[PDB]
Amino acid sequence: SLLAEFPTCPRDEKDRPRVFTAASGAWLTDESGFRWIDFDNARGSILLGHGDPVVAEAVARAATGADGTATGWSRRVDAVLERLHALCGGEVVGLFRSGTAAVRAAVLAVREATGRPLLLSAGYHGYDPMWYPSEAPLEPNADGVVDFFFDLGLLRELLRAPERVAAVVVSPDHMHLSPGWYRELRRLCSAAGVVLVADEVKVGLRYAPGLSTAELLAPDVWVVAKGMANGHAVSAVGGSRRLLKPLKEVSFTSFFEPTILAAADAALARVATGEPQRAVREAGDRFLRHARKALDDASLPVEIAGDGTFFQFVPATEELEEALYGAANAEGLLFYAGDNQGVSAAFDEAVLGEAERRFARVCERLAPYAGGEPVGDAARYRVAWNVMDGLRQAPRDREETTGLLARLL
Amino acid sequence: SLLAEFPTCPRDEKDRPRVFTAASGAWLTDESGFRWIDFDNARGSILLGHGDPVVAEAVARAATGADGTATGWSRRVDAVLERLHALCGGEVVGLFRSGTAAVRAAVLAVREATGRPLLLSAGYHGYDPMWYPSEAPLEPNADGVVDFFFDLGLLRELLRAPERVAAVVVSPDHMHLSPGWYRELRRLCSAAGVVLVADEVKVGLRYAPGLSTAELLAPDVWVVAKGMANGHAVSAVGGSRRLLKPLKEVSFTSFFEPTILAAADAALARVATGEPQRAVREAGDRFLRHARKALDDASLPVEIAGDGTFFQFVPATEELEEALYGAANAEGLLFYAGDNQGVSAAFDEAVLGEAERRFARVCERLAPYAGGEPVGDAARYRVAWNVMDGLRQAPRDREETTGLLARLL
Ligand SMILES: Cc1ncc(COP(=O)(O)O)c(CNC[C@H]2O[C@H](O[C@H]3[C@@H](O)[C@H](O[C@@H]4[C@@H](O)[C@H](N)C[C@H](N)[C@H]4O[C@H]4O[C@H](CN)[C@@H](O)[C@H](O)[C@H]4N)O[C@@H]3CO)[C@H](N)[C@@H](O)[C@@H]2O)c1O
Ligand SMILES: Cc1ncc(COP(=O)(O)O)c(CNC[C@H]2O[C@H](O[C@H]3[C@@H](O)[C@H](O[C@@H]4[C@@H](O)[C@H](N)C[C@H](N)[C@H]4O[C@H]4O[C@H](CN)[C@@H](O)[C@H](O)[C@H]4N)O[C@@H]3CO)[C@H](N)[C@@H](O)[C@@H]2O)c1O
Numbered sequence: 001s002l003l004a005e006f007p008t009c010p011r012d013e014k015d016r017p018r019v020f021t022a023a024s025g026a027w028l029t030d031e032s033g034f035r036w037i038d039f040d041n042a043r044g045s046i047l048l049g050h051g052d053p054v055v056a057e058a059v060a061r062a063a064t065g066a067d068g069t070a071t072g073w074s075r076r077v078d079a080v081l082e083r084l085h086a087l088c089g090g091e092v093v094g095l096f097r098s099g100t101a102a103v104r105a106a107v108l109a110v111r112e113a114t115g116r117p118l119l120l121s122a123g124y125h126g127y128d129p130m131w132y133p134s135e136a137p138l139e140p141n142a143d144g145v146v147d148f149f150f151d152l153g154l155l156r157e158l159l160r161a162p163e164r165v166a167a168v169v170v171s172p173d174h175m176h177l178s179p180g181w182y183r184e185l186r187r188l189c190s191a192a193g194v195v196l197v198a199d200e201v202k203v204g205l206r207y208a209p210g211l212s213t214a215e216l217l218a219p220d221v222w223v224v225a226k227g228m229a230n231g232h233a234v235s236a237v238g239g240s241r242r243l244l245k246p247l248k249e250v251s252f253t254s255f256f257e258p259t260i261l262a263a264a265d266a267a268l269a270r271v272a273t274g275e276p277q278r279a280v281r282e283a284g285d286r287f288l289r290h291a292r293k294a295l296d297d298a299s300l301p302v303e304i305a306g307d308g309t310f311f312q313f314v315p316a317t318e319e320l321e322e323a324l325y326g327a328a329n330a331e332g333l334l335f336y337a338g339d340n341q342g343v344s345a346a347f348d349e350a351v352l353g354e355a356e357r358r359f360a361r362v363c364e365r366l367a368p369y370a371g372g373e374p375v376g377d378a379a380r381y382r383v384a385w386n387v388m389d390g391l392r393q394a395p396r397d398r399e400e401t402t403g404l405l406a407r408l409l
Numbered sequence: 410s411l412l413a414e415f416p417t418c419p420r421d422e423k424d425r426p427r428v429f430t431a432a433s434g435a436w437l438t439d440e441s442g443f444r445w446i447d448f449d450n451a452r453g454s455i456l457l458g459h460g461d462p463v464v465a466e467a468v469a470r471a472a473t474g475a476d477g478t479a480t481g482w483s484r485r486v487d488a489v490l491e492r493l494h495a496l497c498g499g500e501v502v503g504l505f506r507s508g509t510a511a512v513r514a515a516v517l518a519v520r521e522a523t524g525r526p527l528l529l530s531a532g533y534h535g536y537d538p539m540w541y542p543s544e545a546p547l548e549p550n551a552d553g554v555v556d557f558f559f560d561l562g563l564l565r566e567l568l569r570a571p572e573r574v575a576a577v578v579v580s581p582d583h584m585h586l587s588p589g590w591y592r593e594l595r596r597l598c599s600a601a602g603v604v605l606v607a608d609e610v611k612v613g614l615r616y617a618p619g620l621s622t623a624e625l626l627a628p629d630v631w632v633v634a635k636g637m638a639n640g641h642a643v644s645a646v647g648g649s650r651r652l653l654k655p656l657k658e659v660s661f662t663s664f665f666e667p668t669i670l671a672a673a674d675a676a677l678a679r680v681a682t683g684e685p686q687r688a689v690r691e692a693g694d695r696f697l698r699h700a701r702k703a704l705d706d707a708s709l710p711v712e713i714a715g716d717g718t719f720f721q722f723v724p725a726t727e728e729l730e731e732a733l734y735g736a737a738n739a740e741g742l743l744f745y746a747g748d749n750q751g752v753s754a755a756f757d758e759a760v761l762g763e764a765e766r767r768f769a770r771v772c773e774r775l776a777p778y779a780g781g782e783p784v785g786d787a788a789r790y791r792v793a794w795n796v797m798d799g800l801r802q803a804p805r806d807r808e809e810t811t812g813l814l815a816r817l818l
Binding site: 001002003004005006007008009017018019020021022023024028031038040041042043045046050051052055056059060063064065066067068069070071072073074075077081082085091092093095096097100101104108112126127128129132201225226231232233237238241244245246247248249250251252253254255256257259285329334397 | 410411412413414416417418419426427428429430431432433437438447449450452453455459460464465468469472473474475476477478479480481482484485486490491494501502503505506507508509510513517521535536538610623634635640641642646647650654656657658659660661662663664665666668669697741752774
């Protein structure tokens with residue numbers, strides 16, 4: 001047991017990481033030779049498909065030395081910056097090595113630029129300790145962060161002294177929050193005169209060429225990552241020159257590493273067209289129509305939140321949830337267990353037909369659960385918490401909100 | 410000026426980044442078609458040479474999906490962890506995406522494990538704001554870090570209350586600090602009962618197969634990066650299970666990206682032989698004996714600190730330092746300006762012969778500086794501070810130390 005970290009990855013019945021020896025398009029092969037259709041896709045960072053040939057060629061060329069050097073600037077630096085600025089807007093752009101690094105740098109830059117101490121947060125922003133939970137819910141943690149769990153009532157209370165608040169930083173979820181929720185968030189932040197940071201590490205570049213919340217939030221600062229490089233190790237921040245002036249202090253040794261620049265330039269060129277996002281939505285929607293019908297035909301109490309871009313199974317019980325993923329594993333459908341499923345643009349007709357047949361076999365395996373009590377709100381809240389680390393949107397008062405926080409924290 | 414960051418990189422006389430189109434071994438091509446011999450080598454992270462064929466082959470292959478997937482575990486994960494453990498020791502290992510990320514995670518883990526608030530630091534640890542300077546010497550910054558600038562007197566002062574100290578965190582320099590300096594540091598930390606973290610992001614794996622301070626410091630926790638992947642986007646931490654237990658909270662989306670694992674596994678295989686490190690030392694030593702002679706023959710007051718693994722020009726005046734790099738720029742010798750020069754294993758006879766020839770021409774160009782006053786200690790201190798962000802070792806009393814800090818901060 002040499003590894004000190006605990007990486008999120010597909011794990012087997014003994015909680016050991018599944019070992020994958022090969023991948024192409026939508027398909028994985030594991031160490032036993034078992035073949036899987038991938039809905040996890042490095043938690044949605046594989047937008048194009050595994051071993052995408054154009055990205056792979058670009059990386060190959062860059063590995064030889066013929067497309068830039070790690071020692072310094074290249075034309076691919078300008079190309080990537082230009083593309084991000086065109087897609088996502090803002091005045092300036094910075095590049096980082098993980099979503100975690102990017103969101104931390106972004107929010108600290110805003111704290112410095114505004115001179116205000118608190119960050120009000122909803123959703124996951126990466127592994128850094130600055131996001132660890134406070135000792136007392138709804139109080140600042142040691143790094144001045146207060147999590148409001150996507151509850152706008154709580155947010156209103158936290159905005160009551162806006163001079164204390166550097167930014168509101170929110171990781172969107174388009175399965176569990178409506179457009180109106182976003183517009184209200186934007187309204188509240190504008191009224192309070194506080195900066196809005198959209199942490200689009202997951203959703204950026206995937207629902208559209210640009211930011212999912214470009215219009216809904218018009219954020220002052222954005223962060224993207226998973227959509228920009230077909231899995232390669234890069235992230236980005238952009239927004240106003242003034243709010244991001246503190247990023248002038250950022251430099252790191254691997255900045256000019258040419259394979260990541262080549263992958264990002266290639267992937268971003270494809271992203272800019274809108275085609276992979278359309279392909280994903282359409283493929284995912286087809287799979288969903290089939291899956292919803294299969295669950296209904298089998299009288300299985302499993303709803304599906306979301307849409308083809310990202311969806312999530314919502315089973316009525318934890319036992320059923322475990323059985324669902326067990327059956328999926330038996331059929332070679334690799335789902336990101338409990339979380340959101342993000343197909344890639346490699347989900348062609350052949351992949352879809354096979355995923356459909358496999359899912360019908362999943363529903364057969366689930367026959368013991370036929371006719372169970374339908375999904376209720378406690379299940380909806382528990383399942384949504386697993387993907388968003390806070391509360392799905394639905395009517396609540398403070399009693400209900402605080403009850404759910406006590407339950408789900 | 411879309412870029413919000415200010416990356417360290419080769420820059421021209423107007424402070425514009427030099428744009429490099431391609432590289433091969435020790436050589437670079439710029440956008441003008443000018444051909445350079447590289448002593449910068451992505452600040453010492455290109456140990457093997459640009460476009461190393463064996464690493465390139467492994468990277469190209471991994472990009473196709475033939476060696477596993479970014480979705481989860483592959484046997485190359487085990488191979489990289491096992492190689493690092495064999496080379497560097499400790500009980501556990503973690504992987505990160507930059508040196509900055511690794512050192513931050515390491516020291517926060519130690520602070521959590523020990524329950525103590527302060528970090529005592531010497532040297533550079535990356536770009537994160539946690540390392541920004543305090544208001545005054547000997548005062549903690551906002552993140553509990555106190556800089557001792559490599560001065561063991563200042564360290565003893567800070568260790569008067571060691572119950573406050575989670576760790577001492579040191580970035581070695583083997584040009585400006587002797588073996589005995591390290592052994593004293595180790596001694597002081599052990600007596601005080603404080604954890605010692607060796608930040609070997611720069612020096613790890615380059616002086617020897619493993620840590621440069623394996624015996625000198627026997628650190629509780631180590632960090633490496635530049636040596637491990639021929640420039641690719643990975644770093645590592647290792648050491649005691651107890652002190653690094655808090656790393657269980659680390660996960661990041663690109664963890665399984667197979668090209669980086671491929672580069673690390675290939676580079677580490679070569680590092681484990683000791684061959685590239687020896688080649689570097691021997692090639693740089695040959696260059697240095699030629700350069701020292703050339704400087705002496707021209708009566709130029711420029712010393713050279715260090716050795717073939719890493720060396721540094723120490724000119725008697727700033728005006729001469731500027732002229733030296735300007736002249737090297739004309740002859741196409743790319744030095745990391747002001748800092749340390751780190752040749753790669755691609756510095757062969759052909760390259761050395763040409764670098765020697767080119768350096769002779771640099772000496773011809775600096776005639777207007779012949780016969781100048783020889784290097785003094787003020788120059789030695791100023792130049793060393795540029796590479797270590799603290800004080801070179803030399804006899805000092807407390808008053809001299811205080812004055813030097815006033816001058817150089
Ligand atoms: C908006 C945003 N911003 C920034 C980042 C960071 O980018 P990165 O640095 O490139 O990875 C991400 C990275 N995203 C990775 C995933 O992040 C979440 O996943 C998180 C978290 O929700 C999820 O937490 C688990 C929870 O849902 C389960 N119900 C309980 C489990 N113990 C817990 O585990 C995690 O937190 C534990 C507590 N500290 C920790 O011990 C576990 O090891 C850790 N896995 O674990 C993931 C990280 O490990 C999302 N739900 C997912 O859709 C997403 O794909 C991001 O989505
Ligand atoms: C031990 C160790 N630990 C961790 C890391 C982090 O690894 P990474 O995240 O992978 O890069 C490194 C990364 N190393 C990069 C370089 O780190 C230093 O270089 C630093 C710093 O010393 C150097 O500082 C400059 C100073 O030497 C000059 N005399 C004055 C200049 N303004 C200043 O510039 C830097 O610091 C400024 C302080 N605010 C900042 O404004 C500048 O923008 C910044 N470039 O700049 C570099 C980083 O930007 C070393 N001198 C070098 O040998 C080395 O190769 C490391 O060496």
